[PDB]
């Protein structure tokens, strides 16, 4: 069903410049942001505190404020030691959360990339380097693994806190997570990279949730030339997608673009070129 991910982005440019910024997502909806500039974590939804009390939220945030400061210090100290072997600039990303499954099931994860590449995960009761990660990481990870209080805290957050927090968000954010917004579609054309050809573009915008169906059609016949692009975000938590069809001059006549979406309740949009 839903993936919950806490994303940490830390940049170290020198001994005296670093920043750490986090965002939190529930599926494709942003629930939190934590800028380097701010002491406290910001809610980006009315329901971002889920079903936790003010006290439980405070504890949780307090723990993260201590963590953010300790993380930055420890990395700076690590660079001081590794150098010149590894040096600035340095980029570290953390992706931690859980994925919710059908009958109340839950899987947690915690992954770390260095310089844009996956290198470490927390797994079970300890951190580990993934196969092919550089060997100079073995010692710092052993050192980090000797800190048993940190290991216990992480286990508690992944095993217990994450799924508990998420059920609360799912319940509290219900009407937002289950919202239905309708696609609006339009047709245009752009030059083709092929001669004697023109590229037709069906734009579909403002829909939510993500799943959608868009095809160029000639009557009942699906046009297998239809090229769906990626899902692109609108700024208002709705989605945008286009589907293109390269056509020879004169095959243009009789083409339609058809759009299906759960919000339309069976009533497909059909535009004619």
């Amino acid at each position: 069903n839903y993936t919950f991910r806490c994303l940490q982005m830390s940049s170290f440019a020198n001994r005296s410049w670093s920043r750490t910024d986090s965002v939190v997502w529930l599926g494709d909806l942003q629930t939190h942001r934590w800028s380097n500039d701010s002491a406290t974590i910001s809610f980006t939804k009315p329901w971002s505190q889920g079903k936790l009390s003010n006290q439980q939220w405070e504890k949780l945030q307090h723990m993260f404020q201590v963590y953010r400061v300790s993380f930055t210090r420890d990395i700076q100290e690590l660079v001081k030691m590794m150098s010149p072997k590894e040096d600035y600039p340095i980029e570290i990303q953390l992706s931690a959360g859980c994925e919710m499954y059908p009958g109340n099931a839950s899987e947690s994860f915690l992954h770390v990339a260095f310089q844009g590449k996956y290198v470490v995960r927390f797994w079970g009761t300890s951190w580990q380097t993934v196969p092919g990660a550089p060997s100079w990481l073995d010692l710092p990870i052993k050192v980090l693994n000797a800190d048993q209080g940190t290991s216990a805290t992480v286990q508690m957050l992944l095993n217990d806190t994450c799924p508990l927090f998420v059920r609360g968000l799912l319940e509290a954010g219900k009407s937002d997570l289950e919202k239905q917004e309708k696609p609006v579609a339009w047709l245009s054309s752009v030059p083709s990279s092929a001669d004697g050809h023109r590229q037709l573009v069906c734009h579909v915008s403002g829909f939510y949730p993500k799943p959608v169906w868009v095809m160029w059609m000639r009557g009942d016949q699906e046009q297998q030339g239809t090229h769906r692009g990626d899902f692109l975000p609108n700024a208002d938590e709705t989605w945008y997608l286009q589907a293109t069809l390269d056509v020879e001059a004169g095959e243009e006549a009789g083409l339609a673009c058809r759009v299906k979406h759960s919000s339309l309740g069976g009533q497909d949009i059909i535009l004619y070129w």
Binding site: L7, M9, S11, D21, V23, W25, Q30, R33, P89, E91, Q93, S95, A113, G116, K117, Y118, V184, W186, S188, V190, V201, H203, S205, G206, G229, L232, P233, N234, A235, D236, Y240, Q242
Partner: protein, 95 residues
Amino acid sequence: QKTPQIQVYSRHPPENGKPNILNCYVTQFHPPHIEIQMLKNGKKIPKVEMSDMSFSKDWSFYILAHTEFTPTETDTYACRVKHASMAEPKTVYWD
């Protein structure tokens, strides 16, 4: 290092003389430090709003820029990006 991809698209069907929103979606880049400008006839648009920086399953960064605009017949719009992976700023025009 990863070179940014840039896609430019409107929020609503474009109608000349009618207020709309233009989006510039920048993806697939690394490191996260980046400069995004939206241009109207080659001049920087001053009020551009930025989503929070985020990243994908694959570790690469993405960020959405957007601005109010009201398209006419004669206006050109672009998104221009400066990033350490490119010697030259990359400009993508709205179609």
